[PDB]
Amino acid sequence: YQTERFTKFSDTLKEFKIEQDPFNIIREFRSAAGQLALDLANSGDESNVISSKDWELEARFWHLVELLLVFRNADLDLDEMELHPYNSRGLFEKKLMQDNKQLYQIWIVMVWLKENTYVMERPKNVPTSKWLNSITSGGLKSCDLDFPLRENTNVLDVKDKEEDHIFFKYIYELILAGAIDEALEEAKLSDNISICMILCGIQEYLNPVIDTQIANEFNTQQGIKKHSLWRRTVYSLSQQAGLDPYERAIYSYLSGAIPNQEVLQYSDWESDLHIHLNQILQTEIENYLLENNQVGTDELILPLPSHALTVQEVLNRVASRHPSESEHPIRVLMASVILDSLPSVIHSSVEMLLDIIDKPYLLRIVTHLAICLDIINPGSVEEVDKSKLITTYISLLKLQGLYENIPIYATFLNESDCL
Amino acid sequence: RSKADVERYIASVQGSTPSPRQKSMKGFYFAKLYYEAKEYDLAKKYICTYINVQERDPKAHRFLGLLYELEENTDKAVECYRRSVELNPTQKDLVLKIAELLCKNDVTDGRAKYWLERAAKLFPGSPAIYKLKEQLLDCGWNKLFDLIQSELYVRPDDVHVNIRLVEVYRSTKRLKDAVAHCHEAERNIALRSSLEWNSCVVQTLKEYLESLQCLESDKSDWRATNTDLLLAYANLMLLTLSTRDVQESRELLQSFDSALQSVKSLGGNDELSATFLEMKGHFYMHAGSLLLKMGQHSSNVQWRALSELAALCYLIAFQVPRPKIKLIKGEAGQNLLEMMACDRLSQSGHMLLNLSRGKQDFLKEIVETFANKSGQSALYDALFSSQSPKDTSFLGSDDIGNIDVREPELEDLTRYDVGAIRAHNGSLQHLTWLGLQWNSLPALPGIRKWLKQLFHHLPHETSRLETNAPESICILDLEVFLLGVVYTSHLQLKEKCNSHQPLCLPLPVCKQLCTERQKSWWDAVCTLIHRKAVPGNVAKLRLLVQHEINTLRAQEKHGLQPALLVHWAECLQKTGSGLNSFYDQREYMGRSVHYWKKVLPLLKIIKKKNSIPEPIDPLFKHFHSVDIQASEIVEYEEDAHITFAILDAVNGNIEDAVTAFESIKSVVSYWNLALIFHRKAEDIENDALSPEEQEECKNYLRKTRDYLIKIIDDSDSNLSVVKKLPVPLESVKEMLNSVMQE
Amino acid sequence: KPIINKVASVAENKGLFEEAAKLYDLAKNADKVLELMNKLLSPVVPQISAPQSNKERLKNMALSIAERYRAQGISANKFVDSTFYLLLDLITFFDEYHSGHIDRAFDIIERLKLVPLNQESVEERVAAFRNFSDEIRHNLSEVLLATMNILFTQFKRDRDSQLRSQARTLITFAGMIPYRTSGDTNARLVQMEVLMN
Amino acid sequence: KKERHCRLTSWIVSQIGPEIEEKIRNSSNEIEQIFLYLLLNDVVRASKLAIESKNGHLSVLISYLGSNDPRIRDLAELQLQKWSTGGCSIDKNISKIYKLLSGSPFEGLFSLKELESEFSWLCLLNLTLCYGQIDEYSLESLVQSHLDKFSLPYDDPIGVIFQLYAANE
């Protein structure tokens, strides 16, 4: 049956033109692609695993589109936040994310990135308690994480290191996926209290009593006041070798830094891009705080880089670092959406019809995207480009023998007359 | 404020923060008020000092650049924008500005070229981008022509660029080429809808008529170009009436009437003669629309007299016969002419009706009183100033003979609308108008047929309904959309007049009837489907559509009032219940059940008189005018249970469908009960099979007969039941005749 | 719940409505809160809302009770409740009228469908006045005059026929309604309509 | 309350300053020094020395001292019970630091009370006031909490003032 696909997308358009909000179209496009992603994936010829991934990718694209256009377009402007110098850093961070839409967009994108991150299954047969092997062998004169750092790592049993590896890797995957609550649960429950505690430093300080404008979200002070310190402390910890590469990786991510080579070598376009947007973000916040004298000089223990990249440049670098992946045609759209250069790319792939015909999803996707765009933002895509796109896709509806559902797509030109 | 208000605040913060750094960090907020007090040599030094301490603020740097722009110091203003742009790349509008200013001041340096390239990729093919491309070239005739042509290749729908081509032709005084392109471009559906283009079309043609080149060349094609002028006048008239003011619209009428008078003398039996025929009708129709515009603002006595006058105009237009389509040279030309004919009959048609519903056979009086030649002078009087010569004015010389004075038939009107959907490029304005005009009628419009005429081969329902990606748009989504747009529009206008007829407004005169949000969506999905989007804007258009999909499908956070959902549900059931094929029946019934399944939870909370959680920036405006009441809840639950049963029957759960249908003694349940009992009989009725089974088979056909008779018995007795019929009464009787002859 | 009503009950019996409202509102007794809030608003409906006035100090508490009664979905019987939100709309009608925002104020009164503006609505609007809370009928005099003075101002700035027609409507309504100061009001309304012509 | 607390604790640090600096002068063990830096309410130099002496995890943990995060509190205490039930051996000063993170450094079961004999009473009181459970208690009842654990010398007047302050009611 699967050669139903176009129906689903077409179907969604029917429903829209007929209850005469348009963001639902895309939401459905997403779900549609996802549903199809499942079909080709389950039981299939290994020629299908490929086009299955091109559907999952499809789906992620629709999601990213929804998120960003919702934020950008459903922008109806709220009330400005008036801080005082007595206010906590927490509030200033919030203000920053409110006022600077360019940067919040980075947040949105990171959220999307996390959403679609793979995490291993929870490690089984985890041991009763930490470093149990070393303790049992005798030779841990101190039971604290820093003991084998104070003096040769030869202290820790091999099996203990192997388990610490399992743990820190799992925690790392969870952190990259946004699963911070799960990471704290794992830390707690796996007898890694001190690491847990480390994960608690992630929050900026708020006090509901002082920072009135969040006395709703909070009933109790929380987060840590000397955060610039925390951050250097963690970063330095991240640079100290004789720690497991995933643990160092974790601290890197937390300090707004770029994890060690041993770990980073396995990160893909999404993972890598995520890492570097995290860096942009971290740097930008800490700079925002410095420009408002909410950082205390004592805490500038160490040099961290102060110069934030632009999303443009991060993308360019990550691209050159992952050319194969970068060049994939829906991930180009992903980037195009991220930079807003989107009608830009529409008109572009339009002129590539004048090695876009070779891949099937593309001509469809661009067309339905163009439709959505001009629905949500009348004017968005050049009238001509709509004409050209629908023209060509329609002729494929003909080549597929689905003339049945051509009128729906017609509802965008007087050129429709000619059908 | 004044000079004292701002210079006194100096001592206000000077006494609050006296150190030099904080004194200079307030410079931007000092400069914030001098820009308001018209002090630019002072505001400049205030902001410039804040820049001395806050050298990395993109806002401050831009503010100084905008202030140097008022000072007209290009070199200084540009540099300021540059700093704000290099600090923050998201400032697209500043990349245009830099490119805009670099090309205006000096093009000799390639830096102006570079910034123009970036400006292009930030705003794909925007109207300003070409403007800058022409500016850069300015700093030779053949050179300009090649730019426009290369620009028209990829942007043939750009109004401004095509206009420039006519102006370049006109500058070299090769007007024949100017009209030639003007003629070949009147086939473009987009340009035909452009007010400024049609204005250019009217001039370039007239210039050619008087041009020395028109006479010398030949008198054979003279008629051909003359046709386009009339066509242009019609389009230009439609647009001028809507956007322009009372004065400008009336003035355009005089040029139209002059052209008509100058054309009628030639006559003949070719495209020009056929064009004159159809355009003649348009003239009165627009003239009627023009008349109604004046009266709206005016008093009641003038309104009735003017509406009386307009009614005659629309009548004259409607009477005009369908133009002779076969008589045109080409397929494109003839299809166009017919398209306009349908538009004329449709627009004038609904107007004729809405004006005739005011009174009983109001139309008859209009003709019996003003069809007299006295009315012709009363029409010329109200429209024009009597000073103009009444001899060469077409209005005063037309032979108003045997006005049909027959109100239009709905069935004819429907096929006029459907044929004219592409008249105004399917603007949501066009459809929302029609949808509203049918909102007062007893017969409903074929929306699903409208959409098929617009988006051909767009599936009724998309297989991949799971996601909201806008490649899965379906004619149902659109049908569901227009329903809300009209249901929303009607309520909004109802609220307006209540504070202050809504049906009576003609299409040009009325303003936007939908929210700019809705209009943006329709324009997006249209440009996307028809493949007239922009590679750069593809992703934006695509997302704009995606945003609303989840609402048209009643998914997470749908901005849908319960009444609008119910309206969608029943409007799709009855729309589908009348369809012949199973594919369409299933789809429309499916969606109807879907929306029903989303409402019933709301109705149950409403059934116990609780509060519905109001929406956040909904797509379809909520209204307490149609908020559901307990008085109607049990009905919807019942009407929904029917929709459930219908889908159960279509899927195969006949046992549960009949069990449900029989539970409620409704006229519609009869037609369903009958229709499904007939099918169980007909298939088994004639093949060799157990005799006992045959008797049971006949028994079902006996039930079919009975239920159809119950329909007709209850139908003839009461009118309210006639309207509840899921199909026409004559269709029910049609089956019965065949049922009994079986 | 009882003592808060006991304390609220006496303070109500001692004409201390502004307190009895705060106390009854403390026990989430909206039947009494809105009742008293109707009495405190009607006198101040047409008044000028000025800083620290008795209008601001009562309007601002009424709005703080409108939000907390909508966000929490609380309401008294429709009679008490309908009047309470109706007065709040009127208080907005005069606050816009006294500010010179004529267009904006005209739109509000139109929504309320309290005063007819087209002759067709006179029959139904007149019947509605019979069963509307006397806290509303009291302020009918000032509403008609403000609405008239609104049309009156817009006239000095077809449209003329429309204002003229609406002017008439207000008069016939006021003619069929027996209300406060119907003598002085009905006369002034007729004079303002004559100047229009 | 925060202001007053900060001034009191800055002052106590003014007083104990040389005592502790002497003690840091004579220590031969890095983790002990880290602890002493916590005795001067200098979280940052403790964190730094930790970092430098290659005690990095501790370092991170240290950064919590003076945020009163009850999660961290109960976690630190938990770690301490687990050690004080088996825990073949834990360094004498790491346990002290964890006990500081516990928020109840004498009030406890790994108790710093024995430090009664190694430090000015004021020095230990600083520990209660800085870590101790700042948010949950009023300055007074906090100080009182500490005094309830230790008798001060009858003759000492700065002692007397704290007692009169805490005695409130």
Side-chain angles (χ1 to χ4, degrees), chain A residues 221-334:
Chain A
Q221 80 282 345
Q222 194 188 60
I224 87 80
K225 299 183 192 175
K226 280 187 184 73
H227 211 276
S228 286
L229 172 64
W230 179 75
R231 189 192 181 204
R232 279 85 188 163
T233 314
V234 169
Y235 173 81
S236 167
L237 181 51
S238 92
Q239 289 293 297
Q240 273 172 56
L243 295 198
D244 188 279
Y246 284 101
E247 177 174 16
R248 305 204 309 277
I250 289 160
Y251 305 143
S252 285
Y253 189 91
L254 300 188
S255 335
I258 296 185
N260 69 83
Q261 233 303 102
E262 197 161 3
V263 170
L264 199 64
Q265 92 201 91
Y266 299 137
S267 48
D268 57 285
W269 194 80
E270 290 95 40
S271 246
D272 187 331
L273 168 59
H274 175 200
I275 302 287
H276 286 61
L277 291 177
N278 182 54
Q279 175 163 68
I280 295 200
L281 183 53
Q282 202 99 332
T283 299
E284 284 292 359
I285 283 102
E286 182 146 284
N287 281 299
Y288 185 65
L289 297 178
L290 295 160
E291 288 157 43
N292 285 286
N293 320 282
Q294 290 287 329
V295 176
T297 178
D298 299 310
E299 294 180 52
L300 303 188
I301 307 321
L302 294 167
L304 293 177
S306 62
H307 170 81
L309 287 193
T310 74
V311 162
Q312 172 72 76
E313 259 280 308
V314 167
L315 279 169
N316 281 340
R317 294 186 183 173
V318 178
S320 76
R321 203 167 323 124
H322 298 264
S324 38
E325 311 187 49
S326 319
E327 290 161 18
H328 190 301
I330 103 295
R331 254 193 284 267
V332 180
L333 293 163
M334 285 180 172

Side-chain angles (χ1 to χ4, degrees), chain D residues 27-40:
Chain D
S27 69
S28 310
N29 161 305
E30 308 248 58
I31 317 78
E32 175 182 51
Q33 292 176 42
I34 296 169
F35 176 77
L36 295 170
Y37 283 112
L38 303 177
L39 287 184
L40 300 170

Side-chain angles (χ1 to χ4, degrees), chain A residues 4-36 55 58 61-62 65-66 69-70 73 76 102 310 340 342-350 353 363-378 380-393 397 403-417 419, chain B residues 88-90 92 121 124 153-157 189-190 192 335 339 422-423 425 447 451-486 516-517 519-553 556 560 564 568 572 591 595 617 619-620:
Chain A
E4 213 75 53
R5 56 201 78 186
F6 324 89
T7 327
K8 296 217 168 177
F9 293 84
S10 80
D11 232 325
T12 306
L13 298 160
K14 284 177 193 212
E15 292 160 334
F16 180 80
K17 198 221 71 159
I18 318 289
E19 200 208 314
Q20 39 60 220
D21 179 43
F23 290 126
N24 285 292
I25 298 178
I26 308 159
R27 230 162 271 139
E28 272 205 293
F29 285 164
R30 183 201 181 180
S31 200
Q35 189 52 59
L36 296 162
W55 277 113
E58 245 251 45
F61 171 71
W62 295 119
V65 166
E66 173 202 20
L69 288 176
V70 164
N73 225 121
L76 289 191
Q102 265 279 26
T310 74
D340 222 332
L342 194 52
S344 330
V345 182
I346 300 277
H347 192 301
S348 179
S349 44
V350 155
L353 303 144
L363 175 51
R364 189 219 305 111
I365 297 166
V366 185
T367 307
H368 290 81
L369 179 60
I371 301 278
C372 270
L373 276 151
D374 269 299
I375 289 165
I376 298 168
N377 278 322
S380 256
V381 198
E382 191 182 331
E383 257 185 301
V384 188
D385 282 324
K386 309 176 236 133
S387 311
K388 279 186 161 182
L389 277 171
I390 307 167
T391 306
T392 314
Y393 181 66
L397 299 175
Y403 308 102
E404 302 180 325
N405 288 348
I406 302 194
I408 303 58
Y409 295 81
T411 314
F412 304 95
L413 305 162
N414 212 51
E415 285 308 272
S416 186
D417 272 292
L419 299 156
Chain B
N88 181 14
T90 59
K92 309 176 194 172
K121 312 203 184 231
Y153 185 72
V154 295
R155 292 173 66 186
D157 283 5
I189 62 176
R192 184 172 51 84
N335 187 344
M339 196 194 306
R422 305 219 60 178
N425 286 327
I447 292 180
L451 310 178
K452 208 80 182 188
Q453 195 63 16
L454 285 170
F455 320 98
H456 288 292
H457 297 297
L458 186 61
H460 280 281
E461 181 67 83
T462 298
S463 54
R464 299 181 178 174
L465 202 70
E466 70 287 357
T467 61
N468 56 312
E471 303 178 354
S472 74
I473 189 66
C474 63
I475 282 172
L476 266 169
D477 288 327
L478 300 170
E479 194 174 357
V480 176
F481 171 69
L482 295 174
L483 287 167
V485 167
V486 170
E516 190 65 16
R517 184 179 179 184
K519 180 58 173 172
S520 294
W521 188 87
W522 186 264
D523 290 336
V525 62
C526 285
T527 54
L528 285 162
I529 293 285
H530 300 134
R531 181 193 295 280
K532 275 183 169 162
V534 176
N537 229 27
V538 169
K540 174 52 188 160
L541 297 169
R542 203 179 151 285
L543 179 62
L544 181 62
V545 179
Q546 183 176 332
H547 259 303
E548 310 305 339
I549 297 293
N550 277 341
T551 299
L552 299 183
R553 304 183 176 175
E556 293 178 350
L560 296 178
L564 168 57
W568 278 354
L572 281 178
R591 282 290 200 94
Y595 300 121
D617 186 1
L619 173 62
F620 292 107

